[PDB]
Subunit: 104 residues, 6 copies
């Protein structure tokens, strides 16, 4: 299992900013987002651990430059367990398969 | 060829504000409104696509329209000039058959 | 030519029920829908001739403000909404409200 | 169109208290409830205007007697327009027709 | 109609604590739960009124021992009207039919 | 015959925190993650099943992972060692086809 990164902000424009900065800074795949409630949004990515760290640094900085946005919470799990991947929305799906291949 | 068109995103509290933004934006720039999100806590997001400069013009018009609306305020906004294809595939900012007549017209 | 759209929002369902009834009785308009916006806020959306929407809107504001526990949070009137707006936001007519559309215009 | 009454409280236990008190106090029909958000719940009833007034009074008192509940907002509309009944969830349904008839 | 009890906590762990304590303390059937919003959860139970009383006290005690939980609101209706049972989510279902029998 | 396995439940603000807790719990104890809840107000619940001591060990690890996570805090948690069947029937803590593989290991 490749590493997983997750980041959360208030507002959709912030997570859009995070998304574009993350995928351009690191060789990673965006696998999903969550409408978390209370206008908070989460973005989830996968990749080599060093690449997720690089991307996450970029996503933090991008949210903090976005009007009205700030980083609420984030984490990186270097090697997620299969039970985690099965239950939480962090697995790959056919719609992002083309981007996984490009990254690897 | 062409790159992905720019994406603009704006958010306010209350639906009347986002209605004001939508109408001002599409009248002020050569853009397509591609969707809206009921974000929670009575916040609404509007997402638009178009040439970078038309998105910048539309966004100024949207900001001004929200600030003129009773009980509305701009909470947050962004423009991404050249969105990556992975972003367009995962987040609700792509075109759809419903709005395809308007992309055409733009 | 796209008819005007009016939108109004309050905290709590009773206040939006009050708005809806006052609006439809005060102006020759059609109520086209409502939104459960979140945080117990509710939106009502109406269509009709611009002057009828204005009259209906004034009546709705006053009805909400008279309702126990409610007040007007936000509202707007767009005289001539763009087709891209009508297509994306829930402000278009539907079969369920066509009978009301016809009556307002026909009267 | 018979009258409509609507009441809203914080928490489900209060709306349950209101529902039971209203239907026992007045000749009315409970037509629906709404999970409004933020743990608020709405109850909507139909009936003759005087019966709706009687039920509403009983509903408010029941909420105030309920542990942790408070009345947030309420209204009565004597003669709701048909467009209102068509768009908002205040109409009768097969599930409550037996109660409409009684 | 048997009695109905309804209780609401902040957080899911509390409603889980309540549920387990309630069904062990009295001869009741848990009939459903509600994700109410704002991280509040409601539990609904049915049974003889004395058994619902016994269960409710046990639910309250259990919530108050649960880290981070709190009782927000609760009620007991001895004999709910059939209109209430039809509209609000407090009736029995096939999934809980075995527990109703005991 | 067999008793119902123990259930643990934990809640924090934000998804990153629940992700941290899930990975730490499943690695620390012989447990199955059976589900999560988007609780509202950006709070997320995670529910796990296992032997009583394994759930206890997993929960301690989940609490420490949430507290180490930027922007997360443990809001509430509980362990029920022996949940009643009616509870498992009504609340979302039962096993499912998706997690059957993990139950067996």
């Amino acid at each position: 299992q490749s590493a997983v990164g997750s980041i959360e902000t208030i507002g959709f424009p912030g997570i859009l900013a995070a998304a574009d900065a993350m995928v351009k800074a690191g060789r990673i795949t965006i696998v999903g987002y969550i409408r978390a409630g209370s206008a908070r949004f989460t973005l989830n990515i996968r990749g080599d651990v060093q690449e997720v760290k690089t991307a996450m640094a970029a996503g933090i900085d991008a949210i903090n430059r976005t009007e009205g946005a700030d980083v609420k919470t984030w984490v990186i799990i270097p090697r997620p367990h299969e039970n985690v991947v099965a239950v939480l929305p962090i697995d790959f799906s056919p719609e992002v398969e083309p981007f996984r291949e490009a990254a690897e």
